DNA sequence: TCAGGATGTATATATCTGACACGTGCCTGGAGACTAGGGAGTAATCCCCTTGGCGGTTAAAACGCGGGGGACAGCGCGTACGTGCGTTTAAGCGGTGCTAGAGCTGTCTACGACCAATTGAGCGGCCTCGGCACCGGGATTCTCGA
DNA sequence: TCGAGAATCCCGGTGCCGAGGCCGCTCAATTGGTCGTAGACAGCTCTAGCACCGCTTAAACGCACGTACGCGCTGTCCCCCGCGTTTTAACCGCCAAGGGGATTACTCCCTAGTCTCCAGGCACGTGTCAGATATATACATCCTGA
């Protein structure tokens, strides 16, 4: 069929490797493995994952070939990049110039690991004023350095400055920022300079839609950049389940496996450790006060009316009112910390419910948000709760991100919770000190949902992770949840097709056929409150003694010693 | 040769407004040149509206629009009322 | 004291500066939110081709510019150099815009 | 403020003091009085009410919900301010 | 085959037929709709009704039985609406609204 | 003897009351014929025409003096002056 | 059978008349220089209107200006005139 | 039966044919003369020749090779004739003639 | 769908005026909307001239007149020259 | 503030007459019946241009402080303007007589509207490089004090 | 009237993307007939325009005098500019979704015809009264004195 890809592109493997600069051999032809860490590494431990992946990517450089790292999360891409350059240029000693471009959330982090996890290879950063960037730009302008460290846009702005210099091996992080080649960053990189080597570090493959997997594999290697246009309706065929999935997904997806073997690299935590405390993934449900539910039924303010993107309007009122001054005006005239703040929604009511257990067992918590404003009312809500929290969000400031990181990493931290921004989640921190993670809202793409989802269980996690999603029943938001794991079925034939291919196994893929297909069939079965402390205690408390220490919380929320506002929003939202 | 005008019509409407009042010849001339004028404005607008959409046909809906462009405010509202009512009653029979 | 021009010289240096170039003098997003606001009242849920909003901006800036040339003529007429509200309300009263 | 925003100002305050002042500077005005600002917001808001009213009308006539460029060019072409360059 | 006039069917006093003739033979568009004459005639009726009504009122306030150009001048310039409509017009025999500026009157 | 300015007001009421044509005919008609000599020659005017020109022109000058008056009052003078007019025409855009 | 070649006839507009007009417009006290200026203004205006009228006339193969033609010239410049027809 | 374009016969650069089409299908009159397209096209050619010529001169005086809106603005507003023609027009990207009143300059 | 314009024509005339000069896209748009505009004015005038005389036919003589109404002064004289010459040369062959 | 008095303004009463409101005969433009066909209405379809929001940066906006320049208020002067009068004249109103041309009708006829055959002028996509933005550094100038 | 110093032009190098030149694909412009009609042109009236004159007088003109307003001046107080510093919202780059703006195909009924009557609306008389127009009377109103 496309077998000219197999034979022609294996001889073309010879072409890239030698000429340009069972696939386990010919593409990998130059072989080696070493368990002995590089001499520059200071104060570190070797698990086997960054070893196997280590000499696999290092093998790709010996093959003079690039790749993508598809691995899960928490696998320490930092350390693989450190062992990467420190080992390569511990050998070659050439040591430069080479640059990495990392998320603005993680910068002083990278500077930290570069501090304690290797002294010999130093770098240079870009932050703050164009004045400080003047000092280091003219200072080290002359090109005396080991490595360039930058961030996303400063390569665009500084591009005039730092583009005039030659490059060989470049590294990016959070590759899913790339996506389109028409996105400005990519095409700048192309016009920017030329480095013979590249890489992509990420926590997931491309979007469910997967048009741009073309673009990726353009940026990965010479392979497909000539013929790009044609394959669309063939490869998209995965997007008579036996016949449809059989012809479409089994034929072409098998094809792509046989293509995708020498690219992506991944495993799970149980592979490297088994220290993962549990599957540590659960959810819950809720219900919203009918006050605004009546508005969902009628929607005669919503449909023809100034309002717009009424879905976005929903997600705004799905979460919580007080987004608009009048809510507080005809509702809470003094905007003081007040009741019906927590009684308006189920997230705030059952959130009150989980509070005493929160502080009770003291296990810490992360709360994430898709949209900004909500964190404000949440902050006021903690201002009533009085148990302290950090507020982190995009664009807040520059280096107080780092300062807050320090405030967290202190083992004595009294404030248990604090807030992040999903879009800025982006590996923006490392957390070993907490267990519980709570997500809100919608997150139209799961890759970020799972992205923040995985911050909890971390290498060296001594706690046992519990996770819950806050969704209210009988609402558009659980509809979008539906659509979300619908896209878990979409990528289940894509990124669950792309994930398991590392050493090019044999029967594991049919293990995912039978057992995974039992999972998709299980949600086919699926398609076609907890107010009592008993339930929530059970799902949360991780041992019977934890169940017992929650009896001290039975003395208040259990023991314990409307329409007007909708006529106000109907008249005054009656425009 | 007969030179037509709107005289007698204006005169009727007058009699349905102020049964007493007479209207001097000069004033009748003015009201004449008026009605011709306003007519040219409206049919002008309806014309090049029929043009900007590349329709070939002046219809009621244009005339309604053009009337809503020329006449300020209240005259627009009432005039639209008069028109709509009149057309309706025209179609009834 | 630091080097300080007499009042009025910074002014002229501007006047040359701006009368030299063609730039749009009103920052976009304020203006676009302005237009959308004003259009809420007539019909609802309109969508503007960005080229349109550019059109309004260009017109309106040309109109206000004309208005200030004329007003300036009036203020100079009164032997003041400082345009004032009654100067404008005059100018619009003469053009016939009221 | 911090807790709840309540920082919504208004749209028409979007045109600012120094912006208006730049417009004058192009006009040739030398020294601007302090009251002119609220005034010129007045003028501007009228002018826009007119032009936009007409453009909206044209649009509703064609059954489009998209106010285009050709339409604003027509509204102005109608009030005598004819604009060039947009087609 | 009895005849009944389109004005009568309409309930209007302007000669719908005559309008239709003008719209055709003035080369406004190629094809004139069937409702357009009716609608337009209605409009013209309305406007003339306004100007005449106001005028008559004015003449009555001058105790004249008939309407003369001066009375059209006053009925048009006092009404602010029509003033906006007719603002470019020079009426014959017109005269002006009696108008005296503030500063001219003696102390 | 009245104080200066009272005869003025008494006029202003007088004229703003009536409709009469304010320019004696034959001067105006000879004016028009003169101006028309230059373009073509041996024209003949329907007297109704010459009446038309007279009515227009008088309405134009009347407007012009209302506006000029607004300017003179603006300057805190009561006496219209040439630069007042040349202003008014400069604002309307007639130059 | 003859045509006298005219001059200095704009003097036909006379200081008393212009004082009447100015009175109608609401002007209170006229300066003494307004007169020469006004004669300038008027002469401009009539120059335009009469050249357009004459144009229409030349077009129709007539030697005779007519009220219709003036009314069209005024409608043309943007000053509409009523009562004389058209 | 060899073909030759009416522009060529005319000696003009505007597409006489296209003009004739517009005059017919715009409903200006019922019947368009045969000379009218030619004559009109000639006129348009002349005017565009003027505006372009002046503009180009202006751009050359700014030592720019190409004509940009600013140069149309200046070529139109300096020429007094066109200024009289276009006086109601708002040119995009326009700018203004550099203008400073007498009294503003220092002594 | 093709949206026609006068671009290439303007460009030719340019090349017969300033052989060097290029003309930016925006300027070409302006000259376009210009020529369409002036065209609408002229054919407008010639239209309602053909109307006031109750002729049914736009001819050269109207266009000549309308041109003499719109264009001030010198533009009138020269433009009339261009036209007359062009028509003449048209009739010669 | 109060008054005499002249001045112009508005009030009541005959009268005069030409403009209007109406009645009649006449005839052309409207109305009604009938036919076709093409333009507009509506369904189907798809993709791009719009909208909404967030991150991240930095140039502009807001704030405020001082001080120099100008708006405004009053005063004094003298000259240009209004008012009243007596005198002159050109407008106005009415007649007369002439006739140039505005305006209509009766001929034909060049000529412009169609309609069918035919093809290249112009249009959209797509290369592809130089004019212009633009930075940077240098030199030259224009507005302030001592 | 000489320095300082903050703008502003100028030379040179860089890069980059928008003008411009090039090619194949149409459809709109030619050609070339025919045929119905506006209009071109001649021929007639008969009307309103021009020219002139004579007679009346309301208005325009020249002038004299008094006066109040235009205008220059000075002072004074305040408020808008210029500058620096802290803040924030615009701006450019992302991310997404979905909905109106496009097209195309098909149908159906509305309107342009066309022919046949026929009464509304127009020219033209005709009587009669609403508003000039004229005399006489009463009264507000401004000016100047007090
Ligand atoms: N060999 C190791 N020994 C101890 N901890 C490790 C090791 N490798 C990784 N980690 C843990 O991984 C974390 C850093 O992971 P990170 O580089 O952020 O992962 P990724 O880059 O894959 O998202 C550190 O907190 C560290 O505790
Ligand atoms: F960035 Be890894 F998830 F700690
Ligand atoms: Mg990473």
Q: CB distance I37–D82 less than 8 Å?
A: yes
Here the CATH number for the domain that contains residue F40 is 1.10.20.10
**Reduced to 3 states, what is the DSSP secondary structure of residue A124?**
coil
D41 touches chain C (CB under 8 A): no
CA distances from A257 to A261, A333, A493, A504, D36 (A): 6, 62, 11, 9, 71
The finding on whether A73 has its CB within 6 A of some atom of ligand 1 is: yes
B68 and D61 in contact (C-beta within 8 Å)?
A: no
Q: What is the rounded CA–CA span in Å between residue C79 and residue H103?
A: 9
Report, in angstroms and rounded to the nearest whole number, the Rg of chain G calculated over CA atoms.
Answer: 16
**Helix, strand, or coil (residue A528):** coil
β-bridge mates for residue A556, sequence order: none
| Cβ atoms of A73 and A394 closer than 8 Å | no
Q: Which two tokens stand for residue A108?
A: 């002083």
What span, in angstroms and rounded, lies between the C-alpha atoms of A358 and A375?
Answer: 19
Q: Is the dihedral of CA A406, A407, A408, A411 positive or negative?
A: positive
* CB-proximal positions of chain J, under 7 Å: 8-9, 19-21, 29-33, 39-41, 49-62, 67-72, 80-84, 90-92, 100-105, 111-113, 119-124, 131-133, 143-145
Contact A408, D32 (CB under 8 A): no
Q: Of the candidates I30, I66, C14, which has an alpha carbon nearest to the alpha carbon of residue H75? A: I30
Residue boundaries of the structural domains of chain G: 1-84
Ligand 1 and A77: CB distance under 6 A = yes
Segments in A252-304 forming alpha helices (H): 253-260, 269-272, 290-298
3-state secondary structure of G80: strand
Count of structural domains, chain C: 1
Run of H or E residues at B36:
helix B25-52
Q: What angle do CA A106, A415, A75 make, to 5 degrees?
A: 35
- Interface contact flag, C43 D49, Cβ < 8 Å: no
Q: Within 10 Å of residue A199's Cβ, how many Cβ atoms?
A: 24
Instruction: Look at the alpha carbons of A206, A210, A216, A220 in this order and tell me if their dihedral is positive or negative.
Output: positive
What residues in B contact D62, CB-CB < 8 Å? 52-53
Distance CA A53, CA A484 (A): 31
Q: Do G68 and I52 touch (CB under 8 A)?
A: yes
Using alpha carbons, list the distances in angstroms from residue I66 to A186, H50, H81, I45, I50.
59, 19, 17, 5, 10
Q: What angle do CA A84, A177, A150 make, to 5 degrees?
A: 55
Task: List chain C residues with CB under 8 Å of F88.
Answer: 94
Whether chain D has a CB inside 8 Å of the CB on B76: the answer is: no
DSSP conformational letter for A176: G
Do residues A405 and A433 touch, judged by C-beta distance below 8 A?
Answer: no
Give the torsion through C-alpha atoms of H62, H63, H64, H69, to 10 deg.
Answer: 10
Annotate chain I with DSSP letters as a single string.
-----SHHHHHHHHHTT-TT-EE-HHHHHHHHHHHHHHHHHHHHHHHHHHHHTT-SEE-HHHHHHHHHHHS-THHHHHHHHHHHHHHHHHHH-
Tell me whether I13 touches chain G (CB under 8 Å). no
Distance (angstroms) between ligand 2 centre and the Cα of A429 equals 7
Do strands H31-32 and I57-58 pair parallel, antiparallel, or not at all (unpaired)?
Answer: parallel
Estimate to the nearest angstrom the gap between the alpha carbon of A212 and the chain centroid.
Answer: 19
Can you tell me the distance from the alpha carbon of G66 to that of G83, in angstroms, rounded to the nearest whole number?
A: 14
Q: What are A148's strand-pairing partners?
A: A99
Using alpha carbons, select from A33, A499, A514 the residue that is nearest to residue A268: A499
d(CA A295, CA A301): 8
What is the C-alpha to C-alpha distance for residues A159 and B91, in angstroms, rounded to an integer? 72
Tell me the residue ranges of DSSP E strands in A341-471: 365-369, 389-391, 417-421, 436-439, 467-469
CA-to-CA distance for A248 and A365, rounded, in angstroms? 43
> What distance in Å separates the CA atoms of residue E91 and residue F56, rounded to the nearest whole number?
9
- Long-range pairs, A324-329, Cβ under 8 A, ≥24: A325/D6, A325/D8, A326/A568, A326/A569, A326/A572, A327/A569, A328/D4
Rounded to a whole number of angstroms, the distance from the CA of C58 to the nearest CA of chain F is 21
Q: What is the 3-state secondary structure (H, E, C) of G45-78?
A: HHHHHHHHHHHHHHHCCCCEECHHHHHHHHHHHC
CB atoms under 10 Å from CB of F53, counted, come to: 27
- Residue I38's Cβ-side half-sphere holds a number of Cα atoms within 13 Å equal to 26
State whether the Cα torsion I53-I56-I62-I66 is positive or negative. positive
CB contacts of F69 in chain E (<8 Å) are 101
Look at the alpha carbons of E65, E68, E70, E72 in this order and tell me if their dihedral is positive or negative.
positive
Resolution in A: 4.3
3-state class (DSSP) for residue A76 = coil
- The domains located in chain E, with CATH, are 1-107 (1.10.20.10)
Which residues have CB under 8 Å from B61's CB, separation 6+?
A: D61
Answer whether D50's CB lies under 8 Å from D26's CB: no
Tokens of D47: 């002018």
Nearest CA owner, ligand 1 atom 27: A459
| CATH code, residues G1-84 | 1.10.20.10
Size of interface C-F (CB pairs under 8 A): 33
Q: Which residues of E touch I47 (CB under 8 A)?
A: 27
Strands G64-65 and F79-80: unpaired
Rounded Cα gap, residues A499 and A203, in angstroms: 11
Tokens of C24: 């749009």
Q: How was this structure determined?
A: cryo-EM
Rounded to the nearest angstrom, the distance between the alpha carbon of A95 and the centre of ligand 1 is 23
CA–CA separation, I31 and H72 (whole Å): 9
Residue of F28, F39, F69, F78 for testing the chain G interface, max G β-carbons within 10 Å: F39
* Tokens describing residue A90: 């511990």
Annotate chain D with three-state secondary structure: CCCCCCCCCCCHHHCCHHHHHHHHHHHCCCEECCCHHHHHHHHHHHHHHHHHHHHHHHHHHHCCCEECHHHHHHHHHHHCCCECCCC
Q: Is A123 within 8 Å of A149 (Cβ atoms)?
A: yes
CA distances from A377 to A74, A333, A349 (A): 32, 16, 14
Distance of alpha carbon I34 from alpha carbon I7, whole angstroms: 11
Question: Distance (Å, rounded) from C-alpha A457 to C-alpha G70?
Answer: 92
Q: What is the Cα A233 distance to its own chain's centre?
A: 29
CATH architecture entry for D1-86: Orthogonal Bundle (1.10)
> Other C-beta atoms within 10 Å of E88: how many?
10
- How far, in Å, are A284, A348, A349, A361 from residue A537 at the CA level? 13, 18, 16, 11
Q: Is I2 exposed, middle or buried (0-12, 13-18, 19+ CB in 10 A)?
A: exposed
For β-strands E89-90 and G80-81, DSSP reports them as parallel
**Which CATH architecture fits B1-93?**
Orthogonal Bundle (1.10)
The C-alpha atoms of residue A252 and residue A237 are separated, in whole angstroms, by 8
Interface contact D78-B68, CB threshold 8 A: no
The position carrying tokens 């602010």 is E80
- What is the dihedral angle through the alpha carbons of A401, A406, A408, A413, rounded to the nearest 10 degrees? -140
Q: Answer positive or negative: Cα dihedral of A527, A533, A536, A542.
A: negative
Residues in chain H, total: 107
Cα(I74)–Cα(I87) distance, integer angstroms: 20
Helix or strand run (H / E) with residue D66: strand D66-67
Note whether A297 and A455 are within 8 A (CB). Answer: no
Pocket test for ligand 1, best of A54, A74, A117 (most atoms within 8 A of CB): A74
Alpha helices, H only, A63-121: 77-91, 108-116
> What phi and psi values does residue E9 have, to the nearest 5 degrees?
-50, -40
First-last CA distance in chain I: 36
Provide the sign of the torsion angle of the four alpha carbons G60, G65, G71, G72, taken in this order.
positive
CA distance H19 to H5: 13
| Cβ(A17)–Cβ(A65) below 8 Å | yes
Is the sign of the CA dihedral D10, A334, A374, A107 positive or negative? positive
CB contact under 8 A, G52 and I65: no
Give the E:I interface size as CB pairs under 8 Å: 3
- CA A568 to chain CA centroid, Å, is 41
Encoding tokens for residue I33? 């909307």
**From the list E27, E28, E29, which residue is nearest H30 (CB)?**
E27
For residue A459, how far is its CA from the centre of ligand 2 (angstroms)? 9
Nearest Cα residue in chain D from H88: D81
What DSSP assignment string belongs to A371-388?
SSTHHHHHHHHHHHH---
Cα(E95)–Cα(D74) distance, rounded to whole angstroms? 36
The answer to whether the CB of E8 falls within 8 A of the CB of B55 is no
Which residues in chain B have Cβ-Cβ distances shorter than 8 Å to D58?
Answer: 49, 52, 65
Q: Cα(first)–Cα(last) distance of chain B, in Å?
A: 36
**Cα–Cα nearest to E89, from I53, A63, G75:** G75
Residue A99 and residue A147 in contact, taking contact as beta carbons nearer than 8 Å:
yes
For the Cβ of A38 lying below 6 angstroms from any atom of ligand 2, the answer is: no
**Cβ–Cβ < 8 Å for H10, I54:** no
Closest Cα to atom 3 of ligand 2 = A74
**CA-CA distances (angstroms) from residue H44 to B89, D84, E90, G52, I34?**
50, 17, 35, 22, 10
Closest CA to A253 of A14, A513, A520: A513
List, in order of start, the domains of chain A with CATH numbers.
290-493+531-559 (3.40.50.300)
Are C72 and D29 in contact, with CB atoms under 8 Å apart?
A: yes
B12-CA/J9-C1' distance, Å: 39
Nearest to A496 by CA among A212, A179, A244, A208: A208
Are the C-beta atoms of A491 and A484 separated by less than 8 Å? no
Closest CA in chain B for residue G84: B29
| D27-41 burial: b if 16+ Cβ within 10 Å, else e | bbbbebbeebbebbb
Q: What is the DSSP letter of A158?
A: T
Q: Note whether I touches H: 3 CB pairs or more under 8 A.
A: yes
**CA A484 and chain centroid, separation:** 15
CA distance A180 to A161: 25
CB contact H27 to E (< 8 Å): yes
Q: Return d(Cα G79, Cα F94) in angstroms, integer.
A: 13
Listed in sequence order, the DSSP H helices in E62-87 are 69-78, 80-86
Partners of D31 in the β-ladder: C82
The residue of chain F with its CA nearest to that of E70 is F19
Please choose from A69, A71, A72, A76 the residue to mutate so as to test ligand 1's pocket, defined by most ligand atoms within 8 A of CB: A76
- Tokens encoding A63: 């093959």
Residue with tokens 């003094």: A334
F71/G31 Cα distance (integer angstroms): 14
How far apart are the C-alpha atoms of G31 and G29, rounded to whole Å? 7
Q: Do D82 and I34 touch (CB under 8 A)?
A: no
Give Cα D67 to chain centroid, integer Å: 15
Q: Is C91 in contact with F91 (Cβ distance < 8 A)? A: yes
**Do the beta carbons of residue G36 and residue I39 sit within 8 Å?**
no
Angle between helices A400-409 and A108-116 (to 10 degrees): 50
Q: Collect all residues with Cβ–Cβ distance below 8 Å to A551 and sequence separation of at least 6.
A: none
The CA-CA-CA angle for residues A365, A367, A370, to 5°, reads: 165
Q: Counting ligands in written order, which one lies closest to the CA of residue A77? A: 1
How far apart (Å, rounded) are the C-alpha atoms in residues A447 and G31?
84
Per-residue tokens: F61: 């000058």
Indicate the DSSP class of residue A173: S
Rg (CA), chain D: 17
Q: What gap in Å lies between CA A348 and CA A361, rounded to an integer?
A: 20
Q: At what angle do helices I7-15 and H36-61 cross, to 10 degrees?
A: 60
- CA-to-C1' span, D7 to J56 (A): 22
H or E element, residue F45: strand F44-45
CA distance A526 to A520: 10
Q: How far is CA C90 from CA A156, A262, B61, C64, F62, in A?
A: 52, 79, 40, 15, 18
Cα–Cα distance measured from residue A320 to residue A315, given in angstroms and rounded to the nearest whole number: 9
Alpha helices for H11-94 (secondary structure H): 16-25, 36-61, 69-78, 80-86
**Dihedral (Cα; H7, H8, H12, H18), 10-degree rounding:** 10
In this structure, what are the phi and psi dihedrals at residue F81, rounded to the nearest 5 degrees? -145, 160
One DSSP character per residue, C27-88 reads: -HHHHHHHHHHHHHTTSSS-EE-HHHHHHHHHHHHHHHHHHHHHHHHHHHHTT-SEE-HHHH
SS3 assignment for A477-493: HHHHHHHHHHHHHHHHC
């Amino acid at each position: 069929l496309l077998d000219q890809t197999k034979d022609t592109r294996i001889t073309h493997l010879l072409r890239q490797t030698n000429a340009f600069l069972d696939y386990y051999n010919v593409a990998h032809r130059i072989k080696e493995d070493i368990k002995k860490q590089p001499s520059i590494l200071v104060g570190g431990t070797l698990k086997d994952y960054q070893i196997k992946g280590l000499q696999w990517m290092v093998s790709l450089f010996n093959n003079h070939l690039n790749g993508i790292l598809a691995d899960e999360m928490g696998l320490g891409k930092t350390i693989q990049t450190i062992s990467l350059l420190t080992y390569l240029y511990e050998m070659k000693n050439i040591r430069g110039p080479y640059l990495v471009i990392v998320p603005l959330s993680t910068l002083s982090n990278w500077s930290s690991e570069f501090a304690k996890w290797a002294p010999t290879l130093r770098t240079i950063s870009f932050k703050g004023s164009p004045n400080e960037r003047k000092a280091k730009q003219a200072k080290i302008r002359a090109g005396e350095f080991d490595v360039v460290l930058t961030t996303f846009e400063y390569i665009i702005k500084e591009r005039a400055l730092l583009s005039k210099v030659k490059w060989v091996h470049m590294i990016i992080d959070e590759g899913h920022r790339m996506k389109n080649a028409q996105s400005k960053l990519s095409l700048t990189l192309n016009t920017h300079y030329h480095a013979d080597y590249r890489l992509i570090l990420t926590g997931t493959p491309l979007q469910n839609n997967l048009p741009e997997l073309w673009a990726l594999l353009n940026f990965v290697l010479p392979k497909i950049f000539n013929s790009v246009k044609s394959f669309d309706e063939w490869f998209n065929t995965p997007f008579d389940k036996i016949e449809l999935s059989e012809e479409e997904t089994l034929l072409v997806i098998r094809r792509l496996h046989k293509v995708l073997r020498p690219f992506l690299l991944r495993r799970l935590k149980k592979d490297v450790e088994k220290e993962l405390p549990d599957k540590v993934e659960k959810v819950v449900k809720c219900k919203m006060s009918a006050l605004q539910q009546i508005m969902y039924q009628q929607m005669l303010k919503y449909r023809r009316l100034g309002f717009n993107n009424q879905i976005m309007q929903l997600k705004k009122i799905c979460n919580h009112p007080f987004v608009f001054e009048e809510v507080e005006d005809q509702i809470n005239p003094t905007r003081e910390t007040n009741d019906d703040i927590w009684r308006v929604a189920g997230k705030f009511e059952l959130l009150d419910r989980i509070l005493p257990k929160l502080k009770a067992t003291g296990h810490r918590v992360l709360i994430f948000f898709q949209m900004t404003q909500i964190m404000d009312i949440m902050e006021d809500f903690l201002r009533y709760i009085n148990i302290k929290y950090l507020r982190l969000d995009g664009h807040t400031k520059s280096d107080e991100r780092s300062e807050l990181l320090r405030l967290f990493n202190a083992p004595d931290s009294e404030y248990l919770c604090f807030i992040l921004s999903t879009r800025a989640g982006g590996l923006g921190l490392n957390l070993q000190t907490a267990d519980t993670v709570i997500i809100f809202d919608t997150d139209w793409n799961p890759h970020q949902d799972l992205q923040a989802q995985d911050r909890a269980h971390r290498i060296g996690q001594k706690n046992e992770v519990r996770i819950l999603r806050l969704i209210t029943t009988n609402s558009v938001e659980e509809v979008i949840l539906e659509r979300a794991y619908k896209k878990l079925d979409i990528d289940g034939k894509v990124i669950q097709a792309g994930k398991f291919d590392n050493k090019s196994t044999s029967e594991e893929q049919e293990a995912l056929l039978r057992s995974l297909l039992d999972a998709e069939e299980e949600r086919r079965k699926k398609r076609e409150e907890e107010l009592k402390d008993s339930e929530i205690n059970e799902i949360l408390a991780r041992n019977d003694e934890e169940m017992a220490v929650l009896t001290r919380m039975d003395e208040d929320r259990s023991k314990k010693e409307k329409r007007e506002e909708s006529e106000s929003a109907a008249v005054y939202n009656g425009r | 040769t007969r030179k037509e005008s709107y005289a007698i019509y204006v005169y009727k409407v007058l009699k349905q407004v102020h049964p007493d009042t007479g209207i001097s010849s000069k004033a009748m001339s003015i009201m004449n040149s008026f009605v011709n004028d306003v007519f040219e404005r409206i049919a002008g607008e309806a014309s090049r509206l029929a043009h900007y959409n590349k329709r070939s046909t002046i219809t009621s809906r244009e005339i309604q629009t053009a009337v809503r462009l020329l006449l300020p405010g209240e005259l627009a509202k009432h005039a639209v009322s008069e028109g709509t009512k009149a057309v309706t009653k025209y179609t009834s029979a | 004291k630091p080097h300080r021009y007499r009042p009025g010289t910074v002014a002229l240096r501007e006047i040359r500066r701006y009368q030299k170039s063609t730039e749009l003098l009103i920052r976009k997003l304020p203006f676009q939110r302005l237009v959308r606001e004003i259009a809420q009242d007539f019909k609802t849920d309109l969508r503007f081709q960005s080229s349109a909003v550019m059109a309004l901006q260009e017109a309106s800036e040309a109109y206000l510019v004309a208005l200030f040339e004329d007003t300036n003529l009036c203020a100079i007429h009164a032997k003041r150099v400082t345009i004032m509200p009654k100067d404008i309300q005059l100018a619009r009263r003469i053009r016939g815009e009221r | 403020a911090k807790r709840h925003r309540k920082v919504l100002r208004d749209n028409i305050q979007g045109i600012t003091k120094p912006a208006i002042r730049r417009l004058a500077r192009r006009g040739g005005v030398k020294r601007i009085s302090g009251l002119i600002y609220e005034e010129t917001r007045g003028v501007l808001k009228v002018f826009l009410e007119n032009v936009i009213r007409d453009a909206v009308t044209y649009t509703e006539h064609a059954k489009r919900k998209t106010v285009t460029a050709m339409d604003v060019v027509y509204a102005l072409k109608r009030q005598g301010r004819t604009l060039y360059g947009f087609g | 085959a009895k005849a009944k006039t389109r004005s009568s069917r309409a309930g209007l006093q302007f000669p719908v037929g005559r309008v239709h003739r003008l719209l055709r033979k003035g080369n406004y568009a190629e094809r004139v709709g069937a409702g357009a004459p009716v609608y337009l005639a209605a409009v013209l009726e309305y406007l003339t009704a306004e100007i005449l009504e106001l005028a008559g009122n004015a003449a009555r306030d001058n105790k004249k039985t008939r309407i003369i150009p001066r009375h059209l001048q006053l009925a048009v310039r006092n009404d602010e609406e029509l003033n906006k409509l007719l603002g470019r017009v020079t009426i014959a025999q017109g005269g002006v609204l009696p108008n005296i500026q503030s500063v001219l009157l003696p102390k």
